[model samples]
Target: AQYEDGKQYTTLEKPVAGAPQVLEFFSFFCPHCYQFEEVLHISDNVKKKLPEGVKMTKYHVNFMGGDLGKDLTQAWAVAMALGVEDKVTVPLFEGVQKTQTIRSASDIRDVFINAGIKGEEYDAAWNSFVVKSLVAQQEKAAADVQLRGVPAMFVNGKYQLNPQGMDTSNMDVFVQQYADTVKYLSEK
Candidate 1:
């Protein structure tokens, strides 16, 4: 086989999608997830190559950083609720991993404020039903996967990328293959 089942990709025990969506499970405190976006630029490259209408949804798993895990995930949900993810996601990652500036849930809200969202807007969205539902669904999905690590990528919530099998000599090649794998799984 060109791609190994258990090595190149793993069939999830509990699949969670019916649409062509990529689900990425990651953590704010994870240096590798941060590096995946900032250093290697894999996430950007993969997004660029995705098929039309296939969106990648990042799930900030609340299984790390102790209680802080829930805070980070909630902040991410709040951003999603307020439509400020483009402004908030990268900053959260950089603030937590590189700058060491984001320490608490309050700091997370500040990122939204600095992005031009009113503090009241952040507060309202934080407690809104949308944010609550999004967080709950994300948490449930993470629990289904039983993920014990960061930066896990899945297509249509079924096939997960296996870093060891997908490793390549060049970074670009790896990303290309990853995009191809995403396309492959989306149609599966």
Candidate 2:
């Protein structure tokens, strides 16, 4: 029961209803989050390698950016609504975190448009039901996860990850750790 208690992760008072859920919480301002998706491709690997019936869903953190965080989170919802997160996620990290260029939702919209989304569709996504669904989902999940920082993964709404123990010296191994952990916990 090394991981069953307060060490690597903690059990929630009430487990979330999403079955076999692999939920993650992160903020754009976190370099580790950027590296997880962009540099190391860890997020992609885990998604690609996850077992059937197990889904890895992401939430953008609001506490990271005092003012701009909500805007960025909303912009990401637009990207998801358009099914273009693969195209815009990195640009968002690069723009907001690395290059330090993107500021407003309009600027974030520009990144999506640059990725070939028409401005009309981009604007339309703001009021889209799909956007509303994801935004609502993220808000609930973020609150339930009891997060203190970025780059956190939870398995089945119960096992909150402890980041300190994972070592990434071997890139391939590191990727499998997350992937295997997802499959392992999904069986629970």
Candidate 3:
């Protein structure tokens, strides 16, 4: 898709209705996504900078097939259901990537419990049908997009940023370019 600023990005064929729907497709198992978190400054650069009419959504990738894949994906969906995702997302990444402390449902449960999630709340979200549906939805969404990697940003559910061509060695430049691209697309 071509932005108002004339910068082009890979556009989605079936764009969602929301005009400025931004989707960050990521995975807890992706080390690069975790690293890109620091570079993206997602809270400041993307979320906070979003215009009034725009909204951003996060989708944990389920394309990677395996038990661990299903586990982390479900865990994240459960976190979203409980509304504790913002609180546990980064820590969960750190726990799995840095400390390697989280590996199974039991480990994920411990992480939530330590984060002050009541047992009932955990059970409710973890076992809720909505959470299961969300996980399935995300799995389908990832497959529909033919998603090949994590840390992907889709603007208006259409334009996917070409980070491969960006100067990723410098976080500031990368973030600025990414933010500018999103800002430009959003304004249109």
Candidate 4:
């Protein structure tokens, strides 16, 4: 296989056990995810503070419901399916949010090229069957998770972070508070 089994790619084998799992479902285009990155940067330290078994995963789900970029939105899904998210995500994120340039599959592929992925390899991945299926699965998962917006977090697949959007006003406080809440669950 081109991807790792457990870490980089895996079917959700069992319902997450031990400490509740936190899955942050985000999109590359969502400005919120970029802003939220500040807090996500601290996840390692926060994880150390939590009890054992606390795990966090970031899932980028495309097919963001309506006509919100249509084909372009699924870029992360496409990259992950192709096993090149590591090469593409950061550059794509930075390019789209940090610059006035538009984000599209072709544009994102250019970013991947800039990141050292060969144009042909990137093209192959973009056109691969696995990548297409991966995008479909991620879209289904998003529907299962039933996200209404970008930057949605699921705690153990139960609670929805920022469900009421109250905490988002102060992004930093919100993230720390959510981490604390997830940690509290893991304390047992």
Candidate 5:
């Protein structure tokens, strides 16, 4: 591995239980995160590469604090609660990053509706306690980590795999490094 602990990573207060957890902190509006989607998506390559019993999760960061981030955070939580994240997450990312179409709550809501989450269903999921709680949970987790930016990775919540941060220049390398670190930590 090309990473060094303390410099490239740091420990979490507590790790997730049951299975190894790979948590990605990202935002729909982040272009770098859009790029990472290629590697982190639910594909055979990533799936086969993951350690046994390893569970992958994404935490949509709402740190930017605007209609875009706030509603997208809720949108993610809604997709999660409705069990449609696998269907909606990538589209949401593309909608924002590629087309630059997602700009407000309605646009975000339409993305879900287009993904087959009915209006009432979306309304329910969007306003449900579960979705609200998840949004808050993601926010708190991002803050707890003192996250400076997106496209960051956490392994079992015990280690931040890319504390040095990422940028366009090193996105490719950092993406590979993140995967290696997570796979290494999961095996332990």
Candidate 6:
């Protein structure tokens, strides 16, 4: 089902209402997404700098080929459906990028268990058929978004930014341009 704009995103584990939305459609195995994480969400300063109304959401898709990619996509949807993203997204990233640990259901289960979500909640969220459909839906959405690659940012559902294609000496410049475009589109 399509999410209502401005409604609190209970399924996505995001405070969606009234905030400008930023959706980063990605795959776990995309190297570009991996690089962007370091410069994007993982940086404390960058996180602090996002526009006030922006709420960042990462939608993981699995066109990359790998059992781990498959499970990562499912894990992402499960974490969203259970409202555990605030507690789990970072750890899942670290698991793949840092520790290189499990990437399947059990690995995801381990991450959830370590994060204090009860086992039942984890199991239920993963097993929910809706989570499967959501994964499929997000994969399809990624295709329609027409990304040049991962790390593209869709701002307020209007403007799109890609560091790989922008003209700038540094990320800060591109970021400022991105924010400006977002502001410009949001007003139209």
lDDT of 2 by residue, 1-188 (tens): 53445544556777767633788887888888987887678667777767767667777878888678888777778876778878988888999887888887778778888999998888888778888887877777887756677888888877766646556798777777766655556667
- Candidate 2: the clashing residue pairs are none
Q: Say which candidate scores most in TM-score.
A: 1
Which stretches of candidate 4 lie above 4 Å from their native place?
1-20, 38-55, 63-73, 82-87, 163-174, 186-188
lDDT of 6 by residue, 1-188 (tens): 22222321112222233323666676656666665555644323334556556566668877664788788888889878888877876677677777878656788789889999899988888889989897876676566555446655555554555344444577766555545444444443
User: Each prediction's TM-score against the native?
Assistant: 0.89, 0.87, 0.86, 0.68, 0.79, 0.69
What does candidate 3's lDDT look like per residue over 52-84, in tens digits? 666677888765536777788888898888889
> What order do you get sorting by lDDT, best first?
1, 2, 3, 5, 6, 4
Error of 6 at 151 (Å): 2.1
Task: Identify the runs in model 6 with alpha carbons over 4 angstroms from their true place.
Answer: 1-21, 42-57, 146-148, 155-159, 167-169
Best model number under lDDT: 1
Give me the runs in candidate 2 sitting further than 4 Å from their true place: 1-8
| Best of the two (1, 6) by lDDT | 1
Candidate 4 local lDDT, 66-99, one digit each (tens): 4434544455656665567567666666776777
Q: What's the CA error at residue 116 for candidate 2, in Å?
A: 0.5
Model 1 is weakest, by summed lDDT over 10 consecutive residues, at 12-21
Q: What is the lDDT of residue 134 in candidate 2?
A: 79
- Model 5 error, position 94 (Å): 2.3
Give Cα distance to truth, residue 151, candidate 4, Å: 0.8
For each candidate, what is the lDDT? 0.80, 0.76, 0.75, 0.58, 0.71, 0.63
